[PDB]
Amino acid sequence: FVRTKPHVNVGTIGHVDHGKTTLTAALTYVAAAENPNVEVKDYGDIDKAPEERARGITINTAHVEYETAKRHYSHVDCPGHADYIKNMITGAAQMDGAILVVSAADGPMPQTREHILLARQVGVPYIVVFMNKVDMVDDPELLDLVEMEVRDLLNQYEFPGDEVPVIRGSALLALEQMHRNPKTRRGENEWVDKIWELLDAIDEYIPTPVRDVDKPFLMPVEDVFTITGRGTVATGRIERGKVKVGDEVEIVGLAPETRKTVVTGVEMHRKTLQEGIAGDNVGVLLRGVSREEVERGQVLAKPGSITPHTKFEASVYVLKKEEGGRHTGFFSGYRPQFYFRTTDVTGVVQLPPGVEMVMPGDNVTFTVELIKPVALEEGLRFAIREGGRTVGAGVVTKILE
Ligand SMILES: Nc1nc2c(ncn2[C@@H]2O[C@H](COP(=O)(O)OP(=O)(O)NP(=O)(O)O)[C@@H](O)[C@H]2O)c(=O)[nH]1
Ligand SMILES: [Mg+2]
Ligand SMILES: [N+]
């Protein structure tokens, strides 16, 4: 992996079937007619898992690479199915900016809201909107109506909704055009120009993040698998610092105790790296651990730079039924799921002696006790889900134990 341009992590979010995967595929084809380094990815190359073919939806987050003239992108395509929100969050947790896909035909839908909300509670700082399937919507009035709703929906979850770029296009027709002529450059085709229009927005609207490569190494693990000839790979986006082959690193969280290992390889999009730095989306080849000894939700950290915790105080907003949350309140003993970056863990809600009940729409402080240790830190935003439903959004305010 030779690096020439700044690197940025983007991805696709939005409601089920709105066209996130098709857009992703389209992006690779369009980009590759300019930059020959870009490897094109077909629809089936992205939704490739047997279970994805079987069920006809995206299930796993896929990582595709493309590039523009200005920057190198790692793109994380997420599922929109309500049942795979867990995966969407882990994808979003790797994004420096997200492309919210919204179908012009259907308008914003329940996971349009939930994905914006969750993107925030995993720190996604910027959103561009791609209004898709415009080739099915003749009436300009609705298109304006759809934009209006999306811009306002973003304003609710504290995104500059009146400001975000909203690119109107058709992911399918661009992708069809690139299939008919892969050498199709900018300007020759109106649909392919809409993708360029999207690419331009990402280039200019989504800024390259400030990344501290001097702080202790920290990579939240998004995934773990086995490379047949090499070993166990933990993947993820390096949050800070650097990792080289030969470094001792600690696997932190989700197990009773931390374990140390030696990095024996580092790869970004299958091209081996010498070193991995903050921002990079890498695979870290770990030694002496099977894929049963590392998992999604743990972090790789500079040995002893991080202490996992189980108990904290949070400032929490409980969603209203209208925002897709609970219809009724909960008491102490409520045992929902908590999502921090790529981590997902059961915790126990313990309210203050005065507080007997927490109602939807309430802002409240309580203390949470997790059933496994996790890499936490003051100020870390998180999400609460339970019963296939996002119920709350909070932030750690004080680490207790
Ligand atoms: N007419 C039209 N159909 C489109 C367009 N983009 C996608 N579609 C169709 O919409 C369907 C869903 O597209 P897909 O990319 O799978 O959506 P998704 O958002 O990735 N779904 P999921 O939430 O499962 O990941 C497919 O049948 C696809 O062909 C478009 O621009 N125009
Ligand atoms: Mg998809
Ligand atoms: N996928």
Q: What is the DSSP string of 234-287?
A: EEEE--BSEEETT-EEEEESSSSS-EEEEEEEEEETTEE-SEEETT-EEEEEES
Determine whether the annotation assigns residue 77 to a binding site.
yes
Determine whether the annotation assigns residue 78 to a binding site.
yes
Measured over the CA atoms of residue 380, residue 74, residue 207 and residue 110, the dihedral's sign is negative
- Taking Cα atoms as reference points, which of 266, 287, 271, 272 lies closest to residue 219? 266
Question: What spacing in Å lies between the alpha carbon of 19 and ligand 1's midpoint?
Answer: 3
DSSP 8-state class, residue 298: B
Contact assessment for residue 396 and residue 384, using Cβ atoms and an 8 Å cutoff: no
Q: Is the CB of 80 under 6 A from ligand 1?
A: yes
Catalytic-residue membership of 247 = no
Which residues, at least 6 apart from 200, have a Cβ–Cβ distance to it below 8 Å?
none
Contact assessment for residue 384 and residue 390, using Cβ atoms and an 8 Å cutoff: yes
Which residues, at least 6 apart from 258, have a Cβ–Cβ distance to it below 8 Å?
250, 251, 252, 308
Contact assessment for residue 25 and residue 44, using Cβ atoms and an 8 Å cutoff: no
Catalytic-residue membership of 72 = no
Which residues, at least 6 apart from 90, have a Cβ–Cβ distance to it below 8 Å?
61, 222, 223, 296, 341, 342, 344
Resolution of the experimental model in angstroms, please? Answer: 2.7
**Separation in Å, CA 276 to CA 94, 136, 155:** 15, 44, 36
Give the span between the Cα atoms of 242 and 280, in whole angstroms: 10
DSSP β-bridge partners for residue 76: 11, 63
Please name each of the domains of the chain with its CATH number: 1-209 (3.40.50.300), 212-303 (2.40.30.10), 307-400 (2.40.30.10)
The structure tokens listed for 255 are 């197990």
Chain Cα centroid distance, residue 223: 13
- Token pair 């080289």 is found at 244
Question: What spacing in Å lies between the alpha carbon of 365 and ligand 2's midpoint?
Answer: 36
The structure tokens listed for 88 are 């969407």
Which residues, at least 6 apart from 3, have a Cβ–Cβ distance to it below 8 Å?
72
Determine whether the annotation assigns residue 79 to a binding site.
yes
Which ligand places an atom closest to the C-alpha of 57? 1
Contact assessment for residue 125 and residue 115, using Cβ atoms and an 8 Å cutoff: no
DSSP 8-state class, residue 16: T
3-state class (DSSP) for residue 65: strand
Which residues, at least 6 apart from 130, have a Cβ–Cβ distance to it below 8 Å?
23, 99, 100, 101, 102, 166, 167, 169, 171, 198
Nearest CA to ligand 1 atom 28: 19
Give the span between the Cα atoms of 241 and 278, in whole angstroms: 5
- This structure was determined by X-ray
Which ligand places an atom closest to the C-alpha of 23? 1
Question: What spacing in Å lies between the alpha carbon of 78 and ligand 2's midpoint?
Answer: 6
The structure tokens listed for 85 are 């929100």
- Token pair 């939807």 is found at 360
Which residues, at least 6 apart from 210, have a Cβ–Cβ distance to it below 8 Å?
none
**Separation in Å, CA 323 to CA 127, 131, 208, 276, 389:** 20, 22, 31, 39, 10
Chain Cα centroid distance, residue 205: 18
Chain Cα centroid distance, residue 119: 7
